[PDB]
Design a protein around this ligand. Sequence first.
Ligand SMILES: O=C(O)CCC(=O)C(=O)O
Ligand SMILES: O=C(O)CCC(=O)C(=O)O
Ligand SMILES: O=C(O)CCC(=O)C(=O)O
Ligand SMILES: O=C(O)CCC(=O)C(=O)O
Ligand SMILES: O=C(O)CCC(=O)C(=O)O
Ligand SMILES: O=C(O)CCC(=O)C(=O)O
Ligand SMILES: [Fe+3]
Ligand SMILES: [Fe+3]
Ligand SMILES: [Fe+3]
Ligand SMILES: [Fe+3]
Ligand SMILES: [Fe+3]
Ligand SMILES: [Fe+3]
Lengths: 256, 250, 250, 247, 247, 256
Amino acid sequence: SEIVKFNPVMASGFGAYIDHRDFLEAKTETIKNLLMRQGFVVVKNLDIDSDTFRDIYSAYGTIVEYGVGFGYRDTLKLEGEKGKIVTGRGQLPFHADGGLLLSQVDQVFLYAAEIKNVKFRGATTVCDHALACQEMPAHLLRVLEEETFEVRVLDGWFKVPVFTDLGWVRKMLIYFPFDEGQPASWEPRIVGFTDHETQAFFQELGAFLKQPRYYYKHFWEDGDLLIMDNRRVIHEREEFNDDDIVRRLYRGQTAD
Amino acid sequence: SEIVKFNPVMASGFGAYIDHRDFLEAKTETIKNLLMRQGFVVVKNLDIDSDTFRDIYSAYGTIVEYADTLKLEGEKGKIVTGRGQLPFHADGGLLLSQVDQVFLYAAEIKNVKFRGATTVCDHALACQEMPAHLLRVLEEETFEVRVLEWFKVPVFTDLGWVRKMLIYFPFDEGQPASWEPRIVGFTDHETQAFFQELGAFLKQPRYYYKHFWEDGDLLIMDNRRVIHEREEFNDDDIVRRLYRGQTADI
Amino acid sequence: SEIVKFNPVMASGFGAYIDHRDFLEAKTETIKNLLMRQGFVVVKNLDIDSDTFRDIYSAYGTIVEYADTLKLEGEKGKIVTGRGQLPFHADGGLLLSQVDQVFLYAAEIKNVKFRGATTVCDHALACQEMPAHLLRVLEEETFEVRVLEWFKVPVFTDLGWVRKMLIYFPFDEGQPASWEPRIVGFTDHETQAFFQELGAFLKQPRYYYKHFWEDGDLLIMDNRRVIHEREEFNDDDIVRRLYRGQTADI
Amino acid sequence: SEIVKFNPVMASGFGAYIDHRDFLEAKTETIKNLLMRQGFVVVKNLDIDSDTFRDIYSAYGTIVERDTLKLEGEKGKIVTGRGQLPFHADGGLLLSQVDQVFLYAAEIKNVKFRGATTVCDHALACQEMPAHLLRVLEEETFEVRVLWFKVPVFTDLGWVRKMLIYFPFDEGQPASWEPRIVGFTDHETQAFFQELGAFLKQPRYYYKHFWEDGDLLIMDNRRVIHEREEFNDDDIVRRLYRGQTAD
Amino acid sequence: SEIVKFNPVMASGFGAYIDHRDFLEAKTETIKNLLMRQGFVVVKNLDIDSDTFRDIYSAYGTIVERDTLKLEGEKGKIVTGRGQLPFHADGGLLLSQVDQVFLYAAEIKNVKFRGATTVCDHALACQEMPAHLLRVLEEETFEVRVLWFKVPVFTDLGWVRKMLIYFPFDEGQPASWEPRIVGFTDHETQAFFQELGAFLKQPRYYYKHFWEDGDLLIMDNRRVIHEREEFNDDDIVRRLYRGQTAD
Amino acid sequence: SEIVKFNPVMASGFGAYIDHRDFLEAKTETIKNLLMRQGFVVVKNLDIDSDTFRDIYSAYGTIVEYGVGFGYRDTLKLEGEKGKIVTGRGQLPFHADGGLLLSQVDQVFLYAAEIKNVKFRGATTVCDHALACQEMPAHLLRVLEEETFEVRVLDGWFKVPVFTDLGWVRKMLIYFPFDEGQPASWEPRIVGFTDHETQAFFQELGAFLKQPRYYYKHFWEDGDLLIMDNRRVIHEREEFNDDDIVRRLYRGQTAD
Ligand SMILES: O=C(O)CCC(=O)C(=O)O
Ligand SMILES: O=C(O)CCC(=O)C(=O)O
Ligand SMILES: O=C(O)CCC(=O)C(=O)O
Ligand SMILES: O=C(O)CCC(=O)C(=O)O
Ligand SMILES: O=C(O)CCC(=O)C(=O)O
Ligand SMILES: O=C(O)CCC(=O)C(=O)O
Ligand SMILES: [Fe+3]
Ligand SMILES: [Fe+3]
Ligand SMILES: [Fe+3]
Ligand SMILES: [Fe+3]
Ligand SMILES: [Fe+3]
Ligand SMILES: [Fe+3]
């Protein structure tokens, strides 16, 4: 049972800022353990390449790959490619990665390979959903607990269970609607709710989840490493639709 | 001096959720007493008809009639029994009649899950915590109302245990209006800015409970301890039928 | 419905410090109303004699006599008018007489700066926040008292706006005792442990105000909203002379 | 993934009061899950015998043993005795893992303010404690002797740092164990424990359960630490059934 | 070292409401001292002329100038105009130090909810703001053009980090200045300021003073930042005396 | 206007933990500025000697010397010498250093030269008096504000003004009574209060000031440097009366 030195990110005590030297000297297990209760780890000034990034992330579990799989599709390059959604340049609204049985994701790793001309756009943001669900007005929590949420990729509709109870956390899976004007790769709905009701629900929940007690915004710089426990937080990418911006991240996903 | 089991609704400890059996076994006076300090009572899964509803509420005092039990069924063409917003108000200060307790029972609710809420505001805690420039206006300025379906409405009436609030907010743009407020010496710009800013203060989750209705819900409010609002439900598919009762003592 | 200017005493917003001029210009009913939600009023630098004191307090209701104005002058040999502790209690539940407002005026205070406080406790906020095992006892167990200078004293009497508390703490070891409490089904060990732990809860600064007396101080308490205590002042050099008035309505 | 209805015990939101009907209708896994984040579960008005108690608890994992412990207040004994059991978690003096502890009240008479089982939210307390208290817990070696071996204070399970600690018995209470901290004098160790204990007993972190017939207390042993307060009055009947499980 | 009696303005304990008699009886140094930790002083019901106002303020230090500014709501002007003055501290566009600002109300008619002078507790706000907002304030270069030069956001005085910042004017309000942040696009700078402004306007950090005849507002210019809300209704008389001092 | 990296010590945001490398690279002025609002600075693993300690502290102002002065009595060695009070082994109760006109002290520096056999005794403790005075029951604050406090060194009695208003802080000077059994070098009294009242006042104020929101306890190790802004905090030494303990600190005092 080893200890890493860290500082909290949130005023509530959530999140972990870790010095690069303390991170690199830490055992994989010490950070994986810390992620469970801190939700996310932020390390700056780590100058590595994609292979080293791969050696760091692959130690945390079985690589979840981004006509089936042979372990080759490991590192996803999110480089802001025109005409794409996930690897594109617009918003990716509140979601958690992966899916449910073998497609489950426990840890997500995002490394900044190259960031230029961007200072206040394109953040990866992170939400402490368990503290948020514990504190939200019961009228918001009741919908998340009792209603059937369905998603369509843009009878195309399928159910996404909002809460999967792992004991230590209720793992959250949800897919917020992309804001108007943003290229959408998915679309949510709530069974028995109208479009008006669903739209208003998501807007009010989104506003609640983005209050600074639960919300962390990460503005990217070269060398940043953002690791998330995918069952403990949900996340979002803010838009970066300016052609002068260079924003290249490497993405890794693991599970046990 | 009996005790009813309850759980608080708000995080501040205000509000009371009471189980339907506990509610029915409790004496009228036990619930009536709890209402004064908790402001509102929420009972779910209570299966009663309109006659039983009358028998429950009429025990709380003298029935304040309208011109017995009001049927708010969402009629196309009306205001109070219409399908739109009824903004922040307290009951009985327009057609000047003392109202102490307000009762709302859901007879039938269909096709509505995130519209048509009855909302409730803890005004005493909000007045205690609000910025001085907001409270200043409420305490010092003359507030007047005109019916639209000009007279002075005293904002605070000190009953000791609470400063009973009587106020009538402006209806949101596009909602059919039953009243219209004004503040003496304030321009229209100023009054509108005032009410928008105060309304946003009052709707913060520390003071504000939103009730989304289901068949068998009973909402009881102490009319001197809270103010309330109906949110719009202007979609023809919605069935929202509520029974309303109003009581007072002399 | 007039307003008196005031500043809160506690950090929670409870209590009311009122300037002596503001107090004298205010109507009786304005102070009487504020007392219900603030629990207590503190006025400093008020220069009145005993006749004027009577005229101020008698306006609040019907005088509850003792056997008019009580003179608590620290007499060697007595208890209530003695020089020792009077532990946490509310007024009028031993010699069963309703007391709504209690008034204490300092006629003369000399050689005392950190003894002989009258202390005041916000019981409603404390009951709302106390550990369940403490509140459990207060709500469910039978509390009894015996005069010593056995009968049931109902801990809570629900008046709606407050649960009026009637309780009589044990006197600290070495203080002359006017009463003695017991809890039915509790051993002496258990009761003593209970009261020590509850007393420490009630004395935390969030709920507890300690008043150190000065010439011209006036302390008014709403007897249903607070409980109070006198701390010992057993040093012969101390002059602590207070006038006491007690009022109630039916 | 079912939901049991519950109300929190602490103002922080920790603990779960669960109605007896709701408890009995819930899947084992639902409660077992809830315990991880809530720390402890309190059910009142349950009327079961020892066999049913066994059926309830054994479903949570492997029984740690000789299965049900009858803590009845037997004289001349320690754990099964009538005095204090100070702050601890179960299963670190024997070297056997305990995940869940279950306590049931089969008979309580003549006790209203004594013999409590108390529970402490150790993860919130560690996150909020003064740093000079935390430093000792994290960096010093704590040893225990059964009435000398190293017991690690924290074992990092990810979701919680499981606490294994054995507090000293108050004077006058018969000790079943005795702690020490390597490098500290007897003065220093006593002071450290007195100060830490008072921090742990603050109402934000501390629940006291006074027992009544039919109460069931379930604790997740990695998430909380616990204590038994003395009940050395001979008129008291305090008879509890005890069950322990782990994976 | 005298004491003036006061009541705090904010729930945090910042600000000082001081009765007019108590204000007039207090030594200058007592108020000047109080302002450092309280940020701002509010006195109501003071009936003075411009000469007495000058006597009061000039005693606090050297007058920064042409001594008293008559902000009367003159049309076709900016500072002395009728529209918004966004968040700023005084004296960084001219290069002259301002320690204390004094504002007195000589005539107010027909305005009850407009033309406020507002005050912001910047040190509490910086200590509590999201880190992505603070990082910009601490590490980026902010420039201003008077309607381009570097204005340092923080100047460390020890007891406070004095803030010099010039917010952008809302659209439709005549701009007396214009800000920029080096390395940020126009989109980014607008977003940063919109988000920061809303954080600064939260009631924990923000006092709004609606003016009445006889009000005196004194601000310590190193401890707070301030704003004037628009009053572009022609029926309004808003006439303030303004004084500024420094050491 | 430079910035040092630091972490708060208190949950309220008070105090500054500074990495040794960040401290040593910082300009004197940056730490002196920070002390004003953080009250105290804590640096660990600084391995210096008494001359270097002197070069560090003397840059902060004019050396306050511990038959008058010529600048030679600069560094005080508190080594737990038997039969002494200040440089002895018992408690030094709540006080601030120095006095009032030329004997005023602005910054105090305490460096640990040698610490052995002590893990939970002999702490230097630090109190955030301004937050404490702002939050205390008015009955405690009223005594500090309105009564005359006098001190005697053990018509030997002299007045100590509790509050000296510097604007940014009310500088506190107070001398708590030494606990029973501890060798006392001073004795307080309050004019018009009896011994009983004074004793009870100090006990209740002391309990209030020692609540963790205001109180920091420093357990010494080799290489620790504790710097205090003497106007912003008050402090205390807890007893270390065990003969096996080695506790040698170096002390420096400066003022402007
Ligand atoms: O680009 C980012 O900021 C993260 C993208 C993301 O959330 C994903 O690929 O699932
Ligand atoms: O329909 C509702 O939600 C409440 C209507 C109401 O407040 C009233 O009739 O007084
Ligand atoms: O003397 C006092 O401080 C109060 C005495 C008292 O509470 C009473 O007489 O009821
Ligand atoms: O008697 C109790 O309260 C249970 C005590 C306990 O923790 C044990 O026996 O392991
Ligand atoms: O008009 C005001 O409110 C004062 C505005 C101000 O800050 C200035 O003139 O420098
Ligand atoms: O020895 C210490 O811990 C500090 C001693 C001290 O406070 C002093 O010399 O004034
Ligand atoms: Fe993602
Ligand atoms: Fe209504
Ligand atoms: Fe009394
Ligand atoms: Fe145990
Ligand atoms: Fe200005
Ligand atoms: Fe010292």
